[PDB]
Design a protein that fits this description.
Chain lengths: 220, 63, 144, 25, 60, 95
RNA sequence: CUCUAACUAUAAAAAUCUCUCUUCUC
RNA sequence: ACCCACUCGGCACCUUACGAGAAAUCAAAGUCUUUGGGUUCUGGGGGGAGUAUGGUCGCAAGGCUGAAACUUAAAGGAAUUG
RNA sequence: UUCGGGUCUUGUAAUUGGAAUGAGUACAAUGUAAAUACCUUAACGAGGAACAACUGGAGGGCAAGUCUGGUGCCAGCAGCCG
């Protein structure tokens, strides 16, 4: 675990300099991420749960050659989710690369209220859907304490989200796991991508961090 | 809110739950009574309350 | 779009649309045609007793290879003749042709199961006593 | 099989049975 | 040779199995005691934390 | 050279009358019968058969008419058998 | 920032095909 | 009669997804889980079979209407690699 | 330095003892039209506490064995794949 990490991708340089307080200043400005050490540094306690190691095959002139596709979901149960599907000949290498991919694609979500807002919102803020292949997933907010009503895979996704309660409904052939997980992840990520009526005010568009701190990037 | 059926049946529910004491005396709001985490109702079993009062010494004994 | 009748005063056409579309799924059609009684030697019955004629051994299907010990039987409640499988390995010797046998369903709602073709019926009780009891030697056939 | 010829066989059977019925009456 | 006996014996392997007799079998506790004992076995007398629970492990 | 298989009071030697499809065969059995036999597994596509051969066939003790092939003789063992007299010799088969 | 041209020409015959299909987490 | 520019209507075409689907692809096969413009008609796994019979029209071939008993764990779509 | 304290905690012997009571008995009464049955309750009434928990399953769906012995596409199992 040699934390050398020469910083490519100027943002990461800033992350090394400690000039980014949180990934908020990333997500607020839609800053792309390429190095997983950044998401390692900002969110300190990612937990991963590999969902499936699907064997995948191809036909050459001499027999069948096989890889494995790992579908691993990452999160911290505090409003940060990510999904990584990645394939490799070795299972361990596949799962490590999937961890990297999922860590890169971390997505923040909008935990809302079923009604009569109280401390620490429990459910989502809006019914939200997603689609992958024919897997069409739907998430409807839940009264507090109703728990996560979902399929095993979606249930693990929601627990990694930190949402303690949400109703789900999926149509299509959810027998496949990669499509179901991707669609549910897209749906949970669309929560912010939906104008919630408690947000009339148009903000003054605070300067981007890598703009105000472009000096410290690209160490000559 | 303030619906007389709501105000009466929900208040009776709170009264029963605080008479049994599964719900705390601060969370009497008809909203906290929606999440109980089934362990709480187990905690008010006779054997559990005996052991917390003593007399039990490895609950199965009390059982 | 969605080319089904949709006016506020279109109850009849849509209801009869359903009334005609329901004739496609098999369970509903079987239920109302009454074919569970004319066909299906079990007259809507979960169980029925019959008298054995002989002990035929039915050949398995293609990928499997075995010769499963079944038994023919003529039922009493309607008189029709049918085969029935004998589970629980040590029980063909328990058949004793010309003895009453209580047949039940065979796990596939009147359809042949797995690798045993031409038969859809289990065997649970023979000579009053249970095949499961006979196979594990908890009770014996009185041998009337 | 090619459904054209299966239908042709079926119609041949129809013709034979209709001729039999006509001879019966 | 190819077959020791005549095929289709209708319950063959039953007759040729070697019979064995139940040993003394100390009475396992049943009911509440069974649940207590199993819980003690699994989670407070924890045996393998090396990843898999792998309980009832094959002796090897 | 394998030793020929004898009959053990429950199987008998038969002459293939004709060849039937789907693993069936008609066997003139040397007991005064024209029985019907099946291709026992472990032999289906591992040992081929045909019209005009000699096969050991095991009879089903509960169902008489049907029986199953067990072992066939390769133009040497069956002639030996007819030499001892395990089989009636009135059935003459020579190419 | 002015542009609308070049071309070739073969069909002989050829049907059929047995087992045995199964194993990825650290 | 052409050239230009504009417009109305039809057979169509090209680029593209920002929408759609399973995908081939579609500028409609979009405006669909953010499910609702009006409407008729079709289908519920595949064989049996568009077959049996009953009608019904026809000189005739046959057309329309149209199942079951039973059997089966697949048939099928699209693209991918050999 | 051979050790070896067992320095920190777990179980393994499945041996040994101090307490408790029900299921069955059963004086009596209560219960009941009469009654048993229930609630009490005298005296009994547990060591292997023989006062003995069966029913299904252990490749996948699906918690749980790639331990042992036997059969060797036979016996069979298998709701589907096998
Ligand atoms: Mg056979
Ligand atoms: Mg159909
Ligand atoms: Mg057809
Ligand atoms: Mg007609
Ligand atoms: Mg195709
Ligand atoms: Mg007992
Ligand atoms: Mg058992
Ligand atoms: Mg077993
Ligand atoms: Mg398991
Ligand atoms: Mg073994
Ligand atoms: Mg079993």
């Amino acid at each position: 675990e040699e934390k050398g990490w020469v910083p490519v991708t100027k943002l990461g340089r800033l992350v090394k300099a400690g000039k980014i307080s949180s990934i908020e200043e990333i997500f607020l400005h839609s800053l792309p991420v390429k190095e997983f050490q950044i998401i390692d540094q900002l969110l300190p306690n990612l937990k991963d749960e590999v969902m499936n190691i699907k064997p995948v095959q191809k036909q050459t002139r001499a027999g069948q050659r096989t890889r494995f596709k790992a579908v691993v979901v990452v999160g911290d149960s505090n409003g940060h989710v990510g999904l990584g599907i990645k394939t490799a000949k070795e299972v361990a290498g596949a799962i490590r690369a999937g961890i990297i991919i999922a860590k890169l694609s971390v997505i923040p979500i909008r935990r809302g209220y079923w009604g009569t807002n109280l401390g620490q919102p429990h459910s989502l803020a809006t019914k939200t859907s997603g689609k992958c292949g024919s897997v069409s997933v739907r998430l409807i907010p839940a009264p507090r304490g109703s728990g996560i009503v979902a399929s095993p895979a979606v249930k693990k996704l929601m627990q990694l989200a930190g949402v303690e309660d949400v109703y789900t409904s999926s149509t299509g052939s959810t027998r496949t796991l990669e499509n179901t997980l991707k669609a549910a992840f897209v749906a949970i990520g669309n929560t912010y991508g939906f104008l919630t009526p408690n947000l009339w005010e148009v903000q003054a568009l605070t300067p981007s961090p890598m703009d105000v701190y472009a000096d410290y990037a690209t160490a000559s | 809110e303030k619906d007389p059926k709501r105000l009466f049946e929900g208040n009776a529910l709170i009264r029963r739950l605080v008479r049994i004491g599964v719900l705390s005396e601060d969370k009497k709001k008809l909203d906290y009574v929606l999440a109980l985490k089934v362990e709480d109702f187990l905690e008010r079993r006779l054997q559990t309350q005996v052991y917390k009062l003593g007399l039990a010494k490895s609950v199965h004994h009390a059982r | 779009g969605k080319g089904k009748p949709r006016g506020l005063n279109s109850a009849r056409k849509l209801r009869v649309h359903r009334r005609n579309n329901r004739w496609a799924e098999t369970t509903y059609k079987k239920r109302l045609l009454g074919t569970a009684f004319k066909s299906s030697p079990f007259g809507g019955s979960s169980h029925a007793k019959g008298i054995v004629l002989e002990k035929i051994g039915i050949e398995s299907k293609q990928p499997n290879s075995a010769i499963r010990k079944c038994v023919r039987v003529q039922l009493i409640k309607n008189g029709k003749k049918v085969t029935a499988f004998v589970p629980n390995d040590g029980c063909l010797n328990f058949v004793d042709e010309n003895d009453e046998v209580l047949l039940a369903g065979f796990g596939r709602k009147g359809k042949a199961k797995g690798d045993i073709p031409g038969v859809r019926f289990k065997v649970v009780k023979v000579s009053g006593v249970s095949l499961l009891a006979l196979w594990k030697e908890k009770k014996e056939k009185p041998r009337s | 099989m090619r459904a054209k010829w299966r239908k042709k066989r079926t119609r041949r059977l129809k013709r034979k049975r209709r001729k039999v019925r006509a001879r019966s009456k | 040779g190819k077959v020791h006996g005549s095929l289709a014996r209708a319950g063959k392997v039953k007759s040729q199995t070697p019979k064995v007799e139940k040993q003394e079998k100390p009475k396992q506790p049943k009911g509440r005691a069974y649940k207590r004992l199993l819980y003690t076995r699994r989670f407070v007398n924890v045996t393998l934390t090396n990843g898999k629970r792998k309980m009832n492990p094959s002796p090897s | 050279k394998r030793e020929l298989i004898y009959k053990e009071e429950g199987q008998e030697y038969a002459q293939i009358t004709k060849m039937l499809g789907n693993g069936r065969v008609e066997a003139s059995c040397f007991d005064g019968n024209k029985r019907m036999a099946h291709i026992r597994g472990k032999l289906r596509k591992k040992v081929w058969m045909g019209q005009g051969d000699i096969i050991l066939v095991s009879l089903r003790d509960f169902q008489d008419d049907q029986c199953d092939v067990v072992h066939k003789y390769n133009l040497d063992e069956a002639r030996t058998l007819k030499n001892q007299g395990e089989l009636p010799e009135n059935a003459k088969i020579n190419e």
